[PDB]
Design an enzyme around this catalytic site. Sequence first.
Site, PDB file in Angstrom:
ATOM      1  N   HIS A  96      40.573  -1.536  18.995  1.00  0.00           N
ATOM      2  CA  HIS A  96      41.263  -0.273  18.768  1.00  0.00           C
ATOM      3  C   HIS A  96      42.052   0.132  19.970  1.00  0.00           C
ATOM      4  CE1 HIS A  96      41.336   4.274  18.144  1.00  0.00           C
ATOM      5  NE2 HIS A  96      42.066   3.770  17.139  1.00  0.00           N
TER       6      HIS A  96
ATOM      7  N   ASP B 286      -0.037   1.391   1.530  1.00  0.00           N
ATOM      8  CA  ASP B 286      -0.145   0.987   0.133  1.00  0.00           C
ATOM      9  C   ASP B 286      -0.711   2.151  -0.660  1.00  0.00           C
ATOM     10  OD1 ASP B 286      -0.874  -1.878  -1.681  1.00  0.00           O
ATOM     11  OD2 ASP B 286      -1.767   0.053  -2.207  1.00  0.00           O
TER      12      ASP B 286
ATOM     13  N   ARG C 123      10.830   8.456  12.834  1.00  0.00           N
ATOM     14  CA  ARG C 123      11.914   8.562  13.799  1.00  0.00           C
ATOM     15  C   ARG C 123      13.084   7.649  13.374  1.00  0.00           C
ATOM     16  NH1 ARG C 123       8.987   9.545  19.808  1.00  0.00           N
ATOM     17  NH2 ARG C 123       7.580  11.193  19.061  1.00  0.00           N
TER      18      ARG C 123
ATOM     19  N   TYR D 266      14.860   5.313  15.202  1.00  0.00           N
ATOM     20  CA  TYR D 266      14.679   3.949  15.703  1.00  0.00           C
ATOM     21  C   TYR D 266      13.523   3.192  15.023  1.00  0.00           C
ATOM     22  CZ  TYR D 266      11.091   5.978  18.915  1.00  0.00           C
ATOM     23  OH  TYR D 266       9.986   6.602  19.450  1.00  0.00           O
ATOM     24  N   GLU D 267      12.607   3.930  14.395  1.00  0.00           N
ATOM     25  CA  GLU D 267      11.509   3.336  13.638  1.00  0.00           C
ATOM     26  C   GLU D 267      11.873   3.323  12.155  1.00  0.00           C
ATOM     27  OE1 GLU D 267       8.556   6.137  15.065  1.00  0.00           O
ATOM     28  OE2 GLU D 267       7.821   4.681  16.553  1.00  0.00           O
TER      29      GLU D 267
ATOM     30  N   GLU E  74       4.315  -1.025  -4.346  1.00  0.00           N
ATOM     31  CA  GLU E  74       3.713   0.209  -3.863  1.00  0.00           C
ATOM     32  C   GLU E  74       3.482   0.124  -2.353  1.00  0.00           C
ATOM     33  OE1 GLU E  74      -0.330   0.864  -4.850  1.00  0.00           O
ATOM     34  OE2 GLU E  74      -0.917  -1.175  -4.271  1.00  0.00           O
TER      35      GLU E  74
ATOM     36  N   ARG F 162      -1.096  10.337  11.239  1.00  0.00           N
ATOM     37  CA  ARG F 162      -0.375  11.554  10.890  1.00  0.00           C
ATOM     38  C   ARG F 162       0.449  11.371   9.630  1.00  0.00           C
ATOM     39  NH1 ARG F 162       5.118  12.502  11.707  1.00  0.00           N
ATOM     40  NH2 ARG F 162       6.242  11.100  13.140  1.00  0.00           N
TER      41      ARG F 162
HETATM   42  N1  LIG Z   1       7.110   2.540 -12.164  1.00  0.00           N
HETATM   43  C1  LIG Z   1       6.980   1.611 -11.230  1.00  0.00           C
HETATM   44  N2  LIG Z   1       5.774   0.967 -11.090  1.00  0.00           N
HETATM   45  C2  LIG Z   1       5.632   0.020 -10.143  1.00  0.00           C
HETATM   46  C3  LIG Z   1       6.683  -0.314  -9.308  1.00  0.00           C
HETATM   47  N3  LIG Z   1       6.258  -1.277  -8.469  1.00  0.00           N
HETATM   48  C4  LIG Z   1       4.965  -1.554  -8.755  1.00  0.00           C
HETATM   49  N4  LIG Z   1       4.569  -0.750  -9.791  1.00  0.00           N
HETATM   50  C5  LIG Z   1       3.264  -0.707 -10.462  1.00  0.00           C
HETATM   51  O1  LIG Z   1       2.260  -0.115  -9.669  1.00  0.00           O
HETATM   52  C6  LIG Z   1       1.016  -0.712  -9.985  1.00  0.00           C
HETATM   53  C7  LIG Z   1       0.236  -0.954  -8.707  1.00  0.00           C
HETATM   54  O2  LIG Z   1      -0.916  -1.718  -8.989  1.00  0.00           O
HETATM   55  P1  LIG Z   1      -2.168  -1.697  -7.987  1.00  0.00           P
HETATM   56  O3  LIG Z   1      -3.457  -1.658  -8.760  1.00  0.00           O
HETATM   57  S1  LIG Z   1      -2.173  -3.050  -6.945  1.00  0.00           S
HETATM   58  O4  LIG Z   1      -1.905  -0.328  -7.180  1.00  0.00           O
HETATM   59  P2  LIG Z   1      -3.142   0.570  -6.716  1.00  0.00           P
HETATM   60  O5  LIG Z   1      -2.723   1.779  -5.924  1.00  0.00           O
HETATM   61  O6  LIG Z   1      -3.958   0.966  -7.915  1.00  0.00           O
HETATM   62  O7  LIG Z   1      -3.933  -0.499  -5.826  1.00  0.00           O
HETATM   63  P3  LIG Z   1      -5.037  -0.001  -4.791  1.00  0.00           P
HETATM   64  O8  LIG Z   1      -6.067   0.754  -5.594  1.00  0.00           O
HETATM   65  O9  LIG Z   1      -4.404   0.916  -3.772  1.00  0.00           O
HETATM   66  O10 LIG Z   1      -5.658  -1.199  -4.115  1.00  0.00           O
HETATM   67  C8  LIG Z   1       1.286  -2.009 -10.743  1.00  0.00           C
HETATM   68  O11 LIG Z   1       0.720  -1.972 -12.036  1.00  0.00           O
HETATM   69  C9  LIG Z   1       2.796  -2.117 -10.795  1.00  0.00           C
HETATM   70  O12 LIG Z   1       3.280  -2.544 -12.053  1.00  0.00           O
HETATM   71  C10 LIG Z   1       7.899   0.335  -9.448  1.00  0.00           C
HETATM   72  O13 LIG Z   1       8.839   0.047  -8.715  1.00  0.00           O
HETATM   73  N5  LIG Z   1       8.046   1.302 -10.415  1.00  0.00           N
HETATM   74 MG   LIG Z   2      -2.742   1.018  -3.923  1.00  0.00          MG
HETATM   75 ZN   LIG Z   3      43.587   5.094  16.566  1.00  0.00          ZN
END
Ligand SMILES: Nc1nc2c(ncn2[C@@H]2O[C@H](CO[P@@](=O)(S)OP(=O)(O)OP(=O)(O)O)[C@@H](O)[C@H]2O)c(=O)[nH]1
Ligand SMILES: [Mg+2]
Ligand SMILES: [Zn+2]
Lengths: 269, 274
Positions: free
Chosen positions: A51, A137, A169, A171-172, A180, A200
């Site tokens: 530039h 998760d 933040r 940068y993070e 999930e 937190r």
């Molecule tokens: N609507 C929607 N559902 C989703 C998506 N991505 C994943 N899922 C769903 O979320 C569900 C997560 O399954 P898990 O049992 S592993 O999740 P949990 O929170 O019950 O597992 P933990 O109890 O924490 O171990 C699954 O049935 C997936 O199909 C998504 O992008 N949109």
């Molecule tokens: Mg879970």
């Molecule tokens: Zn210029």
Amino acid sequence: AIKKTTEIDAILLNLNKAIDAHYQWLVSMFHSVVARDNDELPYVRLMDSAHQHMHNCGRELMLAIVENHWQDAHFDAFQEGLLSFTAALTDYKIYLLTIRSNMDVLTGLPGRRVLDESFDHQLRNAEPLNLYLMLLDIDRFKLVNDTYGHLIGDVVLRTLATYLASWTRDYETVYRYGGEEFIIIVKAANDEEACRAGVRICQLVDNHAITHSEGHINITVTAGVSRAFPEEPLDVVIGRADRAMYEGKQTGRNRCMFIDEQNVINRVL
Amino acid sequence: TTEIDAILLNLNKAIDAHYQWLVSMFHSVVAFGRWIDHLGPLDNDELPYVRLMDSAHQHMHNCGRELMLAIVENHWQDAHFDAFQEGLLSFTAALTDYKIYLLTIRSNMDVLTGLPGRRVLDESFDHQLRNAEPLNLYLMLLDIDRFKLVNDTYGHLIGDVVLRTLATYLASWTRDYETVYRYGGEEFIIIVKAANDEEACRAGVRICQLVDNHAITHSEGHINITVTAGVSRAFPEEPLDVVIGRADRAMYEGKQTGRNRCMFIDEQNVINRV
Ligand SMILES: Nc1nc2c(ncn2[C@@H]2O[C@H](CO[P@@](=O)(S)OP(=O)(O)OP(=O)(O)O)[C@@H](O)[C@H]2O)c(=O)[nH]1
Ligand SMILES: [Mg+2]
Ligand SMILES: [Zn+2]
Ligand SMILES: Nc1nc2c(ncn2[C@@H]2O[C@@H]3COP(=O)(O)O[C@H]4[C@@H](O)[C@H](n5cnc6c(=O)[nH]c(N)nc65)O[C@@H]4COP(=O)(O)O[C@H]3[C@H]2O)c(=O)[nH]1
Ligand SMILES: Nc1nc2c(ncn2[C@@H]2O[C@H](CO[P@@](=O)(S)OP(=O)(O)OP(=O)(O)O)[C@@H](O)[C@H]2O)c(=O)[nH]1
Ligand SMILES: [Mg+2]
Ligand SMILES: [Zn+2]
């Protein structure tokens, strides 16, 4: 920073704004004569340099035309710099698009792939600070889908994403790693500092219900935090952070766990 | 995707080309047109965007000619430059519109696999159900079995290959009119159109076999996989989320019962393996 797709479109806009702006600039010159982070730093430096140089030629060109000692060289030099400028942008443009073709449609957070490609770099540039990876998760999210439907579930993720992006933040970076599953790359001075950031966020998730058309839904997350030692590959770190999270889920949920250098897990308070 | 980057390139090529053009006019005073017809008649979605910029391009050059003529013959006016600039920005607008459209339409194609993404389906489902008649429509949800293991075992790169491959295979194994979508991380959806539930189930169960019967090659050897699927009917005027949910209900029990199998949920909301 970056995260959030929207952030990128905002830039690309302003890049295209420059193209138009510098067309006008050139028209004016023609009119007047007749009337008498470390990843993206290089791309900006490049175009900044371009530039400058471009305008320099324009000034040199104009001055030469007025004082009656201009030469074909002056126009060719200006055009060289002008195309060099439009190159420099283009490079930057691409880089963005590529990096952000891997942007998660649903949430607007960066996808696993972004992280995969940038991690090795992020670890190197963490010094003197330590880098930590935080895996989150959603707890019993299947229930939420089973209870309210998938649309609603989709909202929760969008929202949670947005919240996490706001709570972190610049940068993070927050990444949608899985369905999930989220990852935040934290940079801190010690393990205790990392854990604080971790614990937190989990509270915040707990302390902020997610609004929807039909009412309110509360959630929580079980997290796993871990150190990233120099030259480790991502998969090693994640694995460790997963090991951390799983025990958290075994022990009750809605809590942040941490795995030490000795590979021993402890809950944070 | 590749097809799009090719265009976007040529759009940016025009920007540079038309900078040069302007410089030449300025030079001379001190002293795309071909590519547009070489796109090959597209479809009704993108026709307007090309017509628009084609129109803009013409008009832009028209001003340039008018401008140049006025400057030479000594009867130019500030209007002539402002008019030219108006048309020049109108041109750079026209491109930009086209650009966006492409990116948007093409953001929703899954980068990794090259299959359409959930969003494509979301937007098109209501339409696909309406046009299914006289036939019945079915949604088939497939979810890779113990894919985490595969990631944990071989790494994510390898995992990424499996998905690419599986995507490619599934695309080849399905009919044209029946679209395969990357719905989720390890989750795929195929929209099947058939005469009865038995026909749908056959399509379902056979895909699962194929997945089972075709190992996925990688640099370092071979990895076998299987998928547990859930098939369901799509009754008129139902929203997608209802159907998916049902198809998920179908799949989950399949996973409870052993995996590598196609399940089906009937009008009575009762699940049975095929
Ligand atoms: N609507 C929607 N559902 C989703 C998506 N991505 C994943 N899922 C769903 O979320 C569900 C997560 O399954 P898990 O049992 S592993 O999740 P949990 O929170 O019950 O597992 P933990 O109890 O924490 O171990 C699954 O049935 C997936 O199909 C998504 O992008 N949109
Ligand atoms: Mg879970
Ligand atoms: Zn210029
Ligand atoms: N056993 C079995 N396999 C199936 C079936 N449907 C699809 N396939 C597999 O999926 C491939 C893709 O079919 P297509 O894309 O519709 O592309 C198909 C399709 O357009 C046409 N075709 C083949 N069979 C039929 C049919 O029964 N009806 C119609 N209308 N077209 C067909 O020929 C093209 C090439 O087919 P292929 O090379 O055989 O390749 C087929 C085949 O390997 C099925 O009902 N039974
Ligand atoms: N390399 C790679 N891995 C992925 C991707 N998308 C999702 N995954 C991973 O796929 C894994 C699947 O985990 P699940 O336990 S939910 O899948 P399973 O097959 O083990 O579950 P089911 O037993 O079939 O219910 C998760 O750990 C995700 O991180 C991806 O795009 N690339
Ligand atoms: Mg699975
Ligand atoms: Zn032209």
